[PDB]
Design a binder for this molecule. Structure first.
Ligand SMILES: [Mg+2]
Ligand SMILES: [Mg+2]
Ligand SMILES: [Mg+2]
Ligand SMILES: [Mg+2]
Ligand SMILES: [Mg+2]
Ligand SMILES: [Mg+2]
Ligand SMILES: [Mg+2]
Ligand SMILES: [Mg+2]
Ligand SMILES: [Mg+2]
Ligand SMILES: [Mg+2]
Ligand SMILES: [Mg+2]
Ligand SMILES: [Mg+2]
Ligand SMILES: [Mg+2]
Ligand SMILES: [Mg+2]
Ligand SMILES: [Zn+2]
Lengths: 151, 107, 173, 129, 125, 242, 146
RNA sequence: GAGUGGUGGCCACUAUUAUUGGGCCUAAAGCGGCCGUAGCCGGGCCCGUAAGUCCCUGGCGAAAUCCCACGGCUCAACCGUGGG
RNA sequence: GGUGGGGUAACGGCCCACCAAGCCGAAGAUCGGUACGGGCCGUGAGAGCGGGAGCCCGGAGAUGGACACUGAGACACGGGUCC
C-alpha cells in the first residue's frame, strides 16, 4: 500500500516479456546513444528522456540492447550518460524531493498557521532521510553529506 | 619465527618486553577471534565476540556478546573496527589477560 | 539436594468411590481370598509395568532396544505367563487374572494340596509347604514355571503322612 | 509486505482444495517451491505441474486431484537430528505413518522417510497429509 | 597489616563485601629501604614452605661489570637519581634501576637488594 | 582440607578402577605417595586381602606383609599402603606364583598369571628426558623412576619409546622404538585394553595432544591419544598379554 | 489482533521478557514471591498456636440463618496478638473458663480463611489445658485441675 | 484397615501464564491519531565461503541415586556382577 | 590504562612515585531484597512448575570485632593477645 496514506492504487505499466528487440525497430545502438546524449544536453531529466524516446521515436525501453562493452549487463539511460560524463551528481529522486521541500519552506514563512501543509513537509523530509540512508550505505554519497534545510 | 599458531608474523620489530613476537611473553591456552570496539588507553584494546545461546523452554535462540580487554603491542597497533586474533597469557593487569597476535582484516 | 527415599511399590485409585470399579474389585477379592485391597493393587501395578515396557519398546530402534526386548520376553515366559513361542505383541493382551493365577496360594489350591483357598493360605503360613526343597511362608510369592512341579508337603510336617486325619479329608475331595 | 513465498503457496493450495478447484497458479515461483512440488508429486498428492515464464519471477501451474487433507509450512524452521523424527510426527501428523514431513538437508529436499533411511537430519520446512 | 589478597572494587566501580577472613599466606612485609652506609647489614627471613630470603638493609660495596665481562668490587659514594620515587635520591635509597656513583664512574643497578642481598650494577658510558 | 592435607578416604569417593564393595563399610585405605598415580594403582592391602584372599582381616594381612612374603619388582614391600600399578610384577616365592597387573576391558585392575622366566623383565615407557650435571642424560619413566645414560648414547632414546628393564638389578636389555608397525597396548580411555599395530600419527597446533591410529587383528582401525599407547614389541609382543 | 508475537527464530529474549512481564498479573504468583502472607500472618506460618483465653463472646450467624455461635478471645503467647477462635461441638463452651490455655488451628475455609455462616472467625479450639476438646464433648475424659 | 481422621505448605486439577497451547465488537483487555531510532521479520536468479545447522570419530562431564537381566540373604525391601 | 619500583612461594593497582583520561551502563550499570553452590529430590502424559536439612563433592565459622607466635601446612573449635 501507500507509505503514509495506506491506499492501494494499482495503476502502472504492463510490460510484455520479450528478449530481443522487435523486428520493426530499425535504430542501431549508435543512433540511440546519440539521441540520448542530444536529449540530455537539451536539459531533460532521465525519466523524461525515456518518455520522449517511446512517444516520438517508437523505441520501447533501451533495456532491450546488450551493453556493447560489458556483455554481462543490459543498457540503461543512466549507464549511457555515465559513459559520456553527463550523469547526475546527486540521484534524481533525492534531488526532486529536496527541490519540493525548499519551495514549501518559503510558503510556510508567510503562512505560519497552515498546519495541514506542514504535515506534508514532515512526510517529505522523512522520505528524504530514508533515501539518504540508503545512498550512504551503497556509497553513492559521501560519508559527510548531510541534509540541513538552512543550507 | 613461529610461536605455535602457524600464522605470519608482523612486518617490523619492536622493543616491548610484553610482545610475544619480539619479547619474553609466552602464550598458552585459548585463541579467540573478534572485532575491536575501543582503543583509547595506551596499548589496550577492547574486543567483542558474538554468539548464540539456545533457550530450551522456548526452543529459540538469543544473541549474546563477550567483551575482552587485550594488550596491544606497538608492532601491530590495531585500530577501531578491524578483525583481530587474540591469545591467552599470564595476568598483565587487573583486567588484561590476552594479547593481540595478528590483524586479519584491516578496517 | 536430597538423599534417596524409598517409595511405595503400588498405586492407589484416582477416585475412591466409583461403583463399577468397586464391584469388579470385590469379585476378584472374594474369588482369590486376598487380605486387603493393597495386596490386589500390588499385583495390578506389576501388570501395568510390563505393559509400559512393551509400549516403549515397540517404538524404539537401535542395539540396546533389541537386547531389552528379548530380555522382556524371556522374563515373561520364565514366569509362566506366556507360551514359549509368543511375540512382543502378545504382551499387550495380558490380564490381571493371569498374574493372580501364579500366586503360591492359588497354585497350592489347584494342585490339590488343600480343599479351599483359605486352607491353602494357612497351610503356607504355618510352614507345611515346601518349594524346591525350601520352605516359603509368603502366600503372595510368584511361582516360576521351572519349579512348579516340585511343590509338596514339607518332609517334617504332620501332613507328610498319608494317615493323618486332616490330610485324608483333603484327599476326599 | 511479502515475507515468505512458500507459506503462501501451501495456504493457497489448502484453501483451493476445500472448494474443489482443479488447478491453481502459484504466482511467485522459486527453486524451493519447485522442490516441494516434486516431492509432493512423487507421493501422489498432486498431478502434473509446469513452469511458465513472464519477465518476473515466473509462475507455477498445478493440477489438483482432491487427495489432500491439509498442507502447511513450518515456521520457524526447526533443526532436527537423525533420530528425533517421532516427536515431530506426533506434533504434526495424525497416525504413525500418515503423511510426510518435508526436510531440507545438505543432500537436498526430501521427505522425512527418505532422510531417516539415509540416517541424516536437517531442517523442517513443511508438512502434508 | 599488609594484605595482598584482592581489591575491594569491581571494574565497573561497585563495592565488594568480604566473604571470609584474611588467610595467612596472603600477607606482605615492610619494604626494606636499602641505604648507603659505612658498614653493610643484612638479615634472614624464614618464608613460606620454610625457605629463606636475605634482606639487605645497609649497603657499602657494589659489584660493577663492564661490557667485556670482568667485574670489580668497589665502594658506593651516593645515589645520583632514582626514577622509582621522587625523593629516593635525597635519602640515599637504593633500588633496582637507580643510578649510583662509585670511585670508578656511574653505574646502574641490575639486582633487587631486598630480595637478593647484594648490589650489582653495570657501568655507564 | 581447610588448613592442611587430607589423610582419610571414604569408600564412596574411592577411585573407580578398584574392585571393592562401596557400601559395605565407611572408610577405605588412602594410599601413600609412591610410584604410579591414584588413577592407575591400588594399595597392596587390597591385593593381599580382597583379590588373592590369603587373609580374612587387615590385622592378619599386616602380619603376612611384615614377614617379607611379597615382592613387587623383586623388592620386599612391607607397607600396606604401598601402591601397585600398571605393568608391575607381583611375586610370592613361597608359593611360587607370579602375576602382572593390567587394566581390564572396562578399565579395572586385574592380576594376570605369567611364567617365571618372563617375571624378571618390566617394560617402562619413556615419559621425559633431560640434561643433568656433568652433562649426563636422565630418563624419567612412566612409573616415576629414573635412569642415567652417557652423552654418547643420547640418540638411542626418545620420549614414547619403551625400555625393557631387568629387575631388581635395573639393567637395560632392550629398546623398542615408537614408529609405524610397532605393536601397542592401550592403557586408558574408551579403547582401553585393545591392542594392535601403529598406522599413522597426527599433530596439532598450540599444545593440543597428538593422536595415533591403530589396526587390530581383525582389520579394524581405531584412534587414541599418543600417550595412551604403550609399545610392547616390534611386530609381536615381548610379554604375555590377555 | 494479528498473529501472536514474537514467533521469530532469533527472538528468544523478547519472548522470555514478555512471559516474565505478564506473570506478575497472576495473584497466586505475586503473593508467594513477595511473601505477602508471611508479613501479616498472626500465626507466623505455623500450623497451630498456643494462647490464653481472655473472654467469651457470641457471634450472630449470617442471613438468612439464625443463631448464635460460641467463641473466645485468645491472646497468643508467641507474639502477644489477639484473635478470635470458635468452639465446636454441642455445649462445648462449658468446658472453657477464663484464664485457660488453649491450642488453636485454622478453621478450613476457602483460601485458608473463614467458612460457612461465620465470617470473621478464622480459627477453632483443639485442646484445653492439654486435653482434647472432642473427648470432653463426647465424654471419655474429664477436665483436669477441676 | 494396624491404621484412620484434623490443620498448614508445594505440584496436579488449570489451555486460570498458554514455546507446544489462551484471549482483546457487545463479557477483563487495541495507546485519541500519526511519524520515526535500536530490536525482531524481510522478494527472484548465479558464483564463492563455511559461522549457524547435519553426519562420522578422539578427550571429558566422580561415586551414590534411575531402568533392565542374572546371582546372595526364605522370596522381597536391601546388597553384588554386567548392559544402558 | 601506561612507565619505574616494592612486596610475595608466585603473576597482578596487591601497594607506592610519576604521566594521562579512561572504565561500566536500558542487551539494566549502581543500589536494595532474599539466599551457602552442585550431584540430586517432590510432582506431572509430556512440555513444564516447585525445593535444595540428613548421604557424597566444594565453601565458610568456632560469643561479636581485630591481631600474632610455632610449623612442611594455621592467623589454629578441646593453643596465645587486646577491646
Ligand atoms: Mg544442600
Ligand atoms: Mg580442622
Ligand atoms: Mg483450583
Ligand atoms: Mg480465557
Ligand atoms: Mg485506537
Ligand atoms: Mg479506545
Ligand atoms: Mg512507524
Ligand atoms: Mg529470500
Ligand atoms: Mg559450521
Ligand atoms: Mg555418576
Ligand atoms: Mg535363596
Ligand atoms: Mg530376585
Ligand atoms: Mg548396588
Ligand atoms: Mg539456591
Ligand atoms: Zn613486537
Amino acid at each position: 500500500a501507500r507509505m503514509h496514506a495506506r491506499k492501494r492504487g494499482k495503476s502502472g505499466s504492463k510490460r510484455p516479456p520479450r528478449t530481443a528487440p522487435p523486428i520493426w525497430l530499425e535504430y542501431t545502438v549508435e543512433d540511440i546513444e546519440n539521441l540520448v546524449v542530444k536529449l540530455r544536453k537539451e536539459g531533460y531529466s532521465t525519466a523524461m528522456i525515456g518518455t520522449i524516446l517511446r512517444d516520438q521515436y517508437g523505441i520501447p525501453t533501451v533495456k532491450l540492447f546488450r551493453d556493447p562493452d560489458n556483455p554481462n549487463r543490459k543498457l540503461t539511460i543512466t549507464r549511457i550518460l555515465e559513459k559520456h560524463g553527463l550523469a547526475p551528481e546527486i540521484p534524481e529522486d533525492l534531488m526532486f524531493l529536496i527541490k519540493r521541500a525548499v519551495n514549501l519552506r518559503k510558503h510556510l514563512e508567510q503562512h505560519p498557521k497552515d498546519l495541514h501543509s506542514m504535515r506534508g513537509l514532515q512526510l517529505i523530509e522523512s522520505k528524504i532521510r530514508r533515501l539518504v540512508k540508503y545512498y550512504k550505505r551503497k556509497g553513492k554519497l559521501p560519508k559527510d553529506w548531510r541534509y540541513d534545510p538552512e543550507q | 619465527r613461529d610461536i605455535g599458531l602457524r600464522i605470519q608474523p608482523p612486518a617490523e620489530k619492536c622493543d616491548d618486553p610484553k610482545c610475544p613476537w619480539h619479547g619474553h611473553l609466552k602464550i598458552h591456552g585459548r585463541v579467540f577471534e573478534g572485532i575491536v570496539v575501543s582503543d583509547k588507553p595506551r596499548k589496550t584494546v577492547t574486543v567483542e565476540r558474538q554468539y548464540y545461546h539456545y533457550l530450551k523452554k522456548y526452543e529459540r535462540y538469543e544473541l549474546r556478546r563477550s567483551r575482552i580487554h587485550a594488550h596491544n603491542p606497538p608492532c601491530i597497533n590495531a585500530k577501531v573496527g578491524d578483525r583481530v586474533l587474540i591469545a591467552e597469557t599470564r595476568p598483565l593487569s587487573k583486567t588484561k589477560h590476552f594479547v593481540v597476535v595478528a590483524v586479519l582484516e584491516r578496517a | 539436594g536430597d538423599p534417596k527415599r524409598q517409595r511405595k511399590k503400588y498405586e492407589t485409585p484416582p477416585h475412591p468411590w466409583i461403583k463399577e470399579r468397586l464391584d469388579r474389585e470385590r469379585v476378584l477379592m472374594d474369588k482369590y481370598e486376598l487380605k486387603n485391597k493393597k495386596e490386589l493393587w500390588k499385583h495390578e501395578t506389576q501388570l501395568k509395568n510390563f505393559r509400559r515396557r512393551a509400549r516403549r519398546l515397540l517404538a524404539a530402534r537401535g542395539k540396546q532396544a533389541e537386547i531389552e526386548r528379548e530380555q522382556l520376553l524371556a522374563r515373561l515366559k520364565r514366569l509362566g505367563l506366556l507360551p514359549e513361542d509368543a511375540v512382543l505383541d502378545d504382551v499387550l493382551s495380558l490380564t490381571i487374572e493371569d498374574i493372580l493365577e501364579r500366586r503360591l496360594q492359588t497354585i497350592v489350591y489347584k494342585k490339590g494340596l488343600a480343599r479351599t483357598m483359605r486352607q491353602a493360605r494357612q497351610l503356607i503360613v504355618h510352614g507345611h509347604i515346601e518349594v524346591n526343597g525350601q520352605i516359603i511362608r509368603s502366600p503372595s510369592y510368584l511361582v516360576l514355571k521351572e519349579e512348579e512341579d516340585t511343590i509338596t508337603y514339607a518332609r517334617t510336617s504332620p501332613f507328610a503322612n498319608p494317615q493323618h486325619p486332616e490330610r485324608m479329608m483333603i484327599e476326599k475331595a | 509486505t511479502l515475507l515468505d513465498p512458500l507459506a503462501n503457496a501451501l495456504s493457497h493450495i489448502t484453501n483451493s482444495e476445500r472448494v474443489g478447484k482443479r488447478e491453481v497458479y502459484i504466482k511467485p515461483a522459486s527453486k524451493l517451491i519447485g522442490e516441494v512440488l516434486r516431492v509432493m508429486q512423487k507421493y501422489g498428492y498432486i498431478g502434473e505441474f509446469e513452469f511458465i515464464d513472464d519477465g518476473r519471477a515466473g509462475v507455477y501451474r498445478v493440477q489438483l486431484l482432491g487427495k489432500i487433507n491439509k498442507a502447511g509450512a513450518i515456521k520457524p524452521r526447526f533443526p532436527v537430528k537423525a533420530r528425533d523424527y517421532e516427536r515431530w510426527e506426533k506434533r504434526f501428523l495424525p497416525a504413525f505413518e500418515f503423511g510426510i514431513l518435508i526436510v531440507s538437508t545438505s543432500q537436498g529436499v526430501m521427505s522425512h522417510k527418505e532422510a531417516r533411511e539415509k540416517g541424516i537430519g536437517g531442517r523442517l520446512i513443511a508438512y502434508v497429509y | 597489616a599488609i594484605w595482598q589478597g584482592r581489591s575491594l572494587r569491581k571494574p565497573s566501580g561497585g563495592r565488594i563485601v568480604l566473604a571470609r577472613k584474611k588467610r595467612k599466606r596472603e600477607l606482605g612485609r615492610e619494604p626494606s629501604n636499602t641505604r648507603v652506609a659505612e658498614q653493610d647489614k643484612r638479615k634472614i627471613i624464614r618464608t613460606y614452605g620454610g625457605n629463606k630470603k636475605v634482606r639487605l638493609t645497609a649497603a657499602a660495596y657494589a659489584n660493577v661489570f663492564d661490557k667485556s665481562g670482568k667485574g670489580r668490587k668497589v665502594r658506593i659514594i651516593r645515589v645520583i637519581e632514582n626514577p622509582a620515587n621522587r625523593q629516593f635520591a635525597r635519602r640515599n635509597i637504593i633500588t633496582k634501576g637507580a643510578i649510583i656513583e662509585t670511585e670508578i664512574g656511574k653505574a646502574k643497578v641490575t639486582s633487587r637488594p631486598g630480595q637478593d642481598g647484594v648490589v650489582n650494577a653495570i657501568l655507564l658510558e | 582440607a581447610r588448613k592442611g592435607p587430607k589423610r582419610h578416604l571414604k569408600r564412596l569417593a574411592a577411585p573407580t578402577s578398584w574392585y571393592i564393595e562401596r557400601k559395605a563399610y565407611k572408610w577405605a585405605v588412602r594410599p601413600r605417595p609412591g610410584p604410579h598415580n591414584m588413577r592407575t594403582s591400588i594399595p597392596l592391602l587390597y591385593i593381599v586381602r580382597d583379590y588373592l584372599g590369603y587373609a580374612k582381616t587387615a590385622r592378619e594381612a599386616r602380619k603376612i606383609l611384615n614377614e617379607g612374603k611379597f615382592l613387587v619388582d623383586g623388592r620386599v614391600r612391607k607397607d600396606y599402603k604401598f601402591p601397585v600399578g600398571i605393568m608391575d610384577v607381583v611375586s610370592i616365592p613361597e608359593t611360587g606364583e607370579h602375576y602382572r597387573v593390567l587394566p581390564n576391558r572396562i578399565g579395572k585392575l586385574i592380576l594376570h598369571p605369567i611364567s617365571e622366566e618372563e617375571a624378571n623383565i618390566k617394560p617402562l615407557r619413556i615419559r621425559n628426558k633431560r640434561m643433568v650435571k656433568g652433562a649426563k642424560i636422565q630418563l624419567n619413566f612412566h612409573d616415576g623412576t629414573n635412569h642415567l645414560i652417557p652423552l654418547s648414547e643420547k640418540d638411542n632414546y626418545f620420549t614414547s619409546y619403551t625400555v625393557l628393564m631387568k629387575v631388581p638389578e635395573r639393567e637395560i636389555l632392550e629398546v623398542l622404538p615408537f614408529e609405524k608397525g610397532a605393536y601397542v597396548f592401550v592403557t586408558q580411555g574408551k579403547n582401553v585394553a585393545r591392542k594392535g599395530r601403529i598406522v599413522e600419527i597426527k599433530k596439532f597446533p598450540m599444545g593440543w595432544p597428538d593422536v595415533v591410529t591403530i589396526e587390530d587383528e581383525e582389520g579394524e582401525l581405531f584412534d587414541t591419544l599418543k600417550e595412551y599407547a604403550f609399545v610392547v614389541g616390534r611386530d609381536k609382543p615381548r610379554i604375555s598379554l590377555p | 489482533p494479528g498473529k501472536k508475537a514474537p514467533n521469530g527464530e532469533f527472538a528468544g529474549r523478547k519472548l522470555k521478557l514478555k512471559r516474565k512481564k505478564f506473570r506478575w498479573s497472576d495473584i497466586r504468583y505475586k503473593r508467594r514471591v513477595l511473601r505477602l502472607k508471611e508479613k501479616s500472618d498472626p500465626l507466623e506460618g505455623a500450623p497451630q498456636a498456643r494462647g490464653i483465653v481472655l473472654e467469651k463472646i457470641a457471634v450472630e450467624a449470617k442471613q438468612p440463618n439464625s443463631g448464635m455461635r460460641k467463641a473466645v478471645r485468645v491472646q497468643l503467647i508467641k507474639n502477644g496478638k489477639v484473635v478470635t477462635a470458635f468452639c465446636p461441638g454441642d455445649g462445648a463452651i462449658k468446658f472453657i473458663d477464663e484464664h485457660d490455655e488453649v491450642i488453636i488451628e485454622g478453621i478450613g475455609g476457602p483460601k485458608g480463611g473463614s467458612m460457612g455462616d461465620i465470617p470473621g472467625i478464622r480459627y477453632k479450639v483443639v485442646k484445653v489445658n492439654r486435653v482434647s476438646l472432642k473427648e470432653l464433648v463426647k465424654g471419655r475424659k474429664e477436665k483436669p485441675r477441676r
